[PDB]
Symmetry: C5
Subunit: 311 residues, 5 copies
Amino acid sequence: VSPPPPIADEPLTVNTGIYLIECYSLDDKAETFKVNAFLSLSWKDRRLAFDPVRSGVRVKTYEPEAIWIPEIRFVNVENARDADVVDISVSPDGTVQYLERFSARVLSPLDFRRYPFDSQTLHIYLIVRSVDTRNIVLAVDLEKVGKNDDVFLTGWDIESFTAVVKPANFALEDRLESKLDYQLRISRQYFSYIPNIILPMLFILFISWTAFWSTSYEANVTLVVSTLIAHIAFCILVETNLPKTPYMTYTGAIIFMIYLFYFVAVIEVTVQHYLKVESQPARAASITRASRIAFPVVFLLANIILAFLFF
Amino acid sequence: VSPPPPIADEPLTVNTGIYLIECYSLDDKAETFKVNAFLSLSWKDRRLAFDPVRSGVRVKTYEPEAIWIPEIRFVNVENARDADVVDISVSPDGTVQYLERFSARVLSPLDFRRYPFDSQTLHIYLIVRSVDTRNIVLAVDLEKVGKNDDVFLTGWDIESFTAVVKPANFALEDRLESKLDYQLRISRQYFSYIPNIILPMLFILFISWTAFWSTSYEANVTLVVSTLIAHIAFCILVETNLPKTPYMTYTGAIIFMIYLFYFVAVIEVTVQHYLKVESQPARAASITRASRIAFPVVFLLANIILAFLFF
Amino acid sequence: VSPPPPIADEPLTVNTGIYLIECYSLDDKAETFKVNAFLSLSWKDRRLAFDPVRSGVRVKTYEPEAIWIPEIRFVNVENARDADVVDISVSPDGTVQYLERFSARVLSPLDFRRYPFDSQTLHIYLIVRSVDTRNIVLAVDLEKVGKNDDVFLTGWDIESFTAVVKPANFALEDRLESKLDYQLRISRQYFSYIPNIILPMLFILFISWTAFWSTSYEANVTLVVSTLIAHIAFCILVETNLPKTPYMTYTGAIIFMIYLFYFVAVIEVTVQHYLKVESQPARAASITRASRIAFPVVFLLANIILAFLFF
Amino acid sequence: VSPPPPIADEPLTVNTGIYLIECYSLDDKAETFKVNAFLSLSWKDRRLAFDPVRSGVRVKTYEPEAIWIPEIRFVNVENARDADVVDISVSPDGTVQYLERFSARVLSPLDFRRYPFDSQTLHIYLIVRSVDTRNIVLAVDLEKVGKNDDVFLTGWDIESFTAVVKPANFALEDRLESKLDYQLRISRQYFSYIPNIILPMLFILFISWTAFWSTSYEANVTLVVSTLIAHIAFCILVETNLPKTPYMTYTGAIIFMIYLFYFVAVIEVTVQHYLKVESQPARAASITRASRIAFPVVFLLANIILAFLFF
Amino acid sequence: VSPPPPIADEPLTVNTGIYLIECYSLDDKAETFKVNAFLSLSWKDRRLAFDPVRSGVRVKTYEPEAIWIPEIRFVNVENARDADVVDISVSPDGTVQYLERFSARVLSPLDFRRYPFDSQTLHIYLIVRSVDTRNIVLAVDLEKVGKNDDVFLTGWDIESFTAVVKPANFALEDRLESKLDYQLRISRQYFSYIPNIILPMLFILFISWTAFWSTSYEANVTLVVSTLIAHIAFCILVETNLPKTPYMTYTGAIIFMIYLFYFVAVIEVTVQHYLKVESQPARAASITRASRIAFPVVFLLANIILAFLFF
Ligand SMILES: [Cl-]
Ligand SMILES: [Cl-]
Ligand SMILES: [Cl-]
Ligand SMILES: [Cl-]
Ligand code: NA
Ligand code: NA
Ligand code: NA
Ligand code: NA
Ligand code: NA
Ligand code: NA
């Protein structure tokens, strides 16, 4: 069992095809996702060619150990894929049709910049290291690339499973390697975020702003500070479902901007009381009345500013 | 070892039967469940047929590698099932009776719309890919489909384990595939939710409404805000035991509706104090007295509205 | 390799014996426990008979694949046990003495009704499916059933590891199956619960009752509400270490009863203030003075009522 | 492949030696720790003896399957060790020198009585079941027992890896068993506890005592209660990193004693206010002034009492 | 299959080379990281040498079991690496060129002293134990040591993957062992820490300092205490993402220093109120006015002191 010799001096083209059966467990923090799929391979091994008329048989079946099969591996995987050979069928001309059903945990980076209104492009890289006798090149059999209709990724909308037809062939440790890119495009289901996180986070912020329609320092302190504790409960809840990014996220920006609205609200509450104690409530009431319009306006504008920078 | 040749031009019917031994680990967030069961298969392999008289035995045992066994796989599984072949018996006419004991983590979507008063239909899909020589079709042997009496799924009531007798035969990658549906119907045990989550969540909401039988702004602020913090503790507790659904859940609706009752309560508390400070407590007391009846009524009606829309 | 033929028409008795080496990881929420033990089996396979004069050895050793060994499996396990064959010894008559050391995660339901003062009976079910040639029956070798002295299950006291000597033989999928029950009786170590959960939970409840020796509504509100937040912290801590039971637990009952004592305390605090504001502190002080005795008495009686119903 | 026959009627001594390469993952709650080590075995198999002058080669190498190797197993392990045979060397007299590199999760109970100032003795039990032909006895080759210099157990100081030279030979299920004890003595690195848990826990307790230099009930209530909520946050943090012990721990004692200092502080705060309202602040101020000295003194003495009982 | 005999009395040099494909899962608490890489080995086995003329081939492919391959293992790993042999090529002079693709969880200690502005040096130790026949020595083939461009370690910047060319040869359990050090230098991505943890932690500290521009004890108590609760929420969040170090970390120092600023702030708040009640607000206002400058100054200086000691 060794590679098939070439007719002329040409490299062996292996026709690939991934058909997704299952898509599950997309870990945002770990930037991984689990996949269960069919892997279909096809090459020309002339040593296995036969006559169809005299044999009576049109297609010949083989066991994996009986024939030479190319060493196809995934690049961005945690461990080696759990493969179960489905079928090996040889045509009269010597064209092998290999099929296996695998399962693997794929390592694909995610861009959290527009979270939770973000979209992602998941990658599945097929690689084949060329042997000494002859060079091995990968090819996409678009007929054998797909996904079933039931394939559901919890909390995500699956757009398209496509493959970059042209492989990226390169030199690695003195040998040629043919690499293929299978792209799974997805968009996040941002519905749940609005009633669970966005709106409650806004209510607690507006509750803090009732301190502008009050002169009671003790009550105002309780208002701005207590809601700030509620806001801490919400920030810690969101920042845990996300990994530590070296960039600003859309959520992260909002979360941080809100922390300033709590700080400036304390400043106002402190100032209003300081002037009241300093026997000048004509000065305090004017600031407090300005804040009634200033805080919602500056908030609404700053959100438009951020939404523009991010989308 | 190859498929048995057909007498006429008919496809091979394989008689299936799943008998549940164990049902455990139903992950709501991951929409999975673990199963430990018997898988029983039966087909007609004429090449194995024997005259009982000459052989001197009316049953023939075979090791898996000795005879041709159909490649039966599960569709909605994480990895390939952990199978242990129990027995293979051949009757005189060549009817094989295969039995194995497997364990697999099944991927079955759950509908959380009526949670925790929801019911579910778990699926176990058996699939067989037809070979080149002949086509393979799946069949249900209702005599061999069941579950033992001890089978308990923690926090759920097991209704029925049944199978859709008619398989869904279709074409996939130019080959025929026969798919079978085993349905495990379950209903949730919603008892624990009432004393642990529902009632305490209602008490904290009613505690906030005592601010209608009080004129003290500082006390009212403490009442509505503190209880809101308690409510945040309960929402975060529930939304973690649930996945991020692109639809509204019965719990999610209630949870969100309660967040409004806290917001409107702050508005009232702010208004009552604003009028009191503006030297018109005849206006404030009338609103506060109205809210004493308005809040419980609007809450009870809104709950009837939601319960109607959801059930 | 097939079962030994019977002398007369009798079933094959297999002498079982489980000797616990390790007991660990009792997951209350999952109702599982890990075990590491010796499994000892014994049957008469006359085919393996030998003359020690002609063979030279008094007792013959064999590799698992060389001789017929009964397919003994556990019923209530997650996956198939991790077995390592220790020794196989055959005596001149053909009496096989099999020993293996296994490890398995056992699925045994727990009754949380009297938690954390509950006791449990863990089960380990041995099963053997009878072959077509002859019937297989399981038997208990009480000499080979035990546990070592060091065997410790963290947070539990191990009472006894015993076996139901009479197997439950029944019909399953056209064949006979002999089932054996190994019972591991345990009682929970409830010590830690008193200083960590019970007493702190009582202190925070009594702290709320200081609102009966105070007329300050603003202080009383802070007292009853803040301690309620502390109580929420403790309920969520306990209800997480427990699964969602369709029945009431001893802890669950107490936890819920305490939530009422917080609710009724708010009512009192609201009433006392309402009467004080309504210029009748002779009415308010009488209720507040009654509550000083009413709350500890009703609590003490309700605990006796619950403890009676549960024990 | 069977045990070597004895020269005179003596048992086979197997010279053991464990050399720790890695020590990691000490789970306090689970009372486990992971180990990666060399296991070195040595016995006299006269059947493998050879003439050194005639053969020409000093030492002869063998594959595991070629020669008889004793079935050495670990007692206190979760699953069977992950062993890779390093080398098998046979001297001319027939003395076998076996070496393997294993990795295993060890189950060793921990004594939390003096936590986090506690020391532990981890155990690694080697066992060998004696065969029918002859008895097997374990022996310690102190030259082959050790640990490398880099071996670090996060948060612990490794004292000594020693072995009890005398094995505990006993009868189990009719056969003799030779058990050996490898002890890994460790002491906890209690540094981190002081700035992270001990001191912050003391600050929050002292902050509650500022209520003795104040007559404001509303402020005192906020002081004692808020700091109690902070203390609950710290107790829940510590009690989670620890398992549920049927005995009192040094930390557990302190934690509980602090819960009393919070309770008695509330009593004082309630009393001081009750007397103030009852028009006798000469009585209230005297108690409050006494508690300024009483609370730090009783705390300092009670800590000396506990530290004495525990150390 | 035994080691190749030496020409003269020299040890066998094995030319190593690690090429990182994947770098992921750097567990700070566990001080581990997962790696997926190519391992390339090269030695001179004269017994495999051949003439290229009569062969008609420049290279000879071998199966792992066919030829002698050195027992290369990793020192600082949890379990034995998951290796898949890629290719084994033999040149005419007998120089073997071995390549495998492995995946392993590496145990490398981390220095948290400068966290989260810390840098790390990850180690991958290759070891080979010398056989009885001849000694084995490791060597670095710098041509075969690298990493691909896509290699990303979430939250870290990968500086350089280099190897210490000189192996550390030493005696262990009466045999020579050659050890090699592969160093992966990384620096933390400290960006996320500033908007998520550092700045919010500073805002809550400054919010507590508004108690210097207020005379209301009840408000000041609420200010300092509530923000202290927010600070506890942040300390517990940071100290969990870190292991228990027997040394002070840069974060740990800050965290602890902040706990003092909260304590001294309570002292001030207590003193200001005590003097106010003791009818001397000329003394209280002077301290409160001093604290307005004292607290930001001492904080700014103490941070410069710590930053100097740590960097
Ligand atoms: Cl792979
Ligand atoms: Cl499957
Ligand atoms: Cl089993
Ligand atoms: Cl290794
Ligand atoms: Na092959
Ligand atoms: Na077969
Ligand atoms: Na308050
Ligand atoms: Na057998
Ligand atoms: Na052997
Ligand atoms: Na070899």
